[PDB]
Write a protein that binds this ligand. Sequence first.
Ligand SMILES: [Tb+3]
Ligand SMILES: [Tb+3]
Length: 110
Amino acid sequence: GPGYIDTNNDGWIEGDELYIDTNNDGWIEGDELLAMQIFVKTLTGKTITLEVEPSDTIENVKAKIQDKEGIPPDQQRLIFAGKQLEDGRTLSDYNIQKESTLHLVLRLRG
Ligand SMILES: [Tb+3]
Ligand SMILES: [Tb+3]
């Protein structure tokens, strides 16, 4: 859902002219201007890309991981730069930014 818009109107497409089209219509609407991409290195799989925003909470992110990889949020733990990412937290208050990368840890059960 990423893509590009020539906002400086210079005829070309630059690095700052990436925008993430959240709603996957052909467009970029005002509310998708903060959307960004972050990666998650899954445990047993590959590195996976998410379309999140800085205001999103961790439960959100996990919600997204489930949708994508089929793991339940209670079974997920997420790690960034050594810190256990806790619930009810924006990922801007952890200082997670465009193209940051997260660690999936999975609980035992058995
Ligand atoms: Tb341009
Ligand atoms: Tb759109």
